[PDB]
């Protein structure tokens, strides 16, 4: 499918060279950054979406996530389906596991306090995570069946909000350097 949303947010730290490529392709070269999130996807997320991507380059030199990323409002929730990472595997309060698209994912919840949200300014909000137990190999055509994650999250009392915001296949980094090149459809 054609992506219609370009996400390019940085807290201003370091260098984040994000390139909005043709179609669903984007690339990012980053160095000594604060926190940033770059990715392509859809303006309005859906619990029924099947996301396809191929990360031709996944080269983080530190803390970075290759992840499906999105938000819902009412309530405010930042969610993640992490397929690969750099030096740090994100974790939180363990809820259980789910097998989706050939991989096994741990389900976690965490809370952010006085942190920047989608609306701007800062607030306290919950984060939902599905984190692969081992890094998914990159360079191949991968699929993330979001319904598989949404249903598993629901079984653990992790219900998404009623107002859907953007949904993208992103590269997120935190105080690190690296490069990525991803195509989304």
UniProtKB/Swiss-Prot annotation:
Q: Name one GO biological process term.
A: xylan catabolic process
Q: Which reaction does it catalyse?
A: Endohydrolysis of (1->4)-beta-D-xylosidic linkages in xylans
- Indicate the segments forming the GH11 domain, all copies: 1-185
Q: In which pathway does it act?
A: Glycan degradation; xylan degradation
Q: What class of enzyme is it?
A: hydrolase
State the UniProt keywords alphabetically. Carbohydrate metabolism, Glycosidase, Hydrolase, Polysaccharide degradation, Signal, Xylan degradation
Q: Does the keyword Signal apply?
A: yes
Q: Does the keyword Hydrolase apply?
A: yes
Q: Which SUPFAM superfamilies match?
A: Concanavalin A-like lectins/glucanases (SSF49899)
Entry's EC annotation: 3.2.1.8
Q: Which family does it belong to?
A: Belongs to the glycosyl hydrolase 11 (cellulase G) family.
Name recorded for this polypeptide: Endo-1,4-beta-xylanase
Q: Which organism is it from?
A: Niallia circulans (Bacillus circulans)
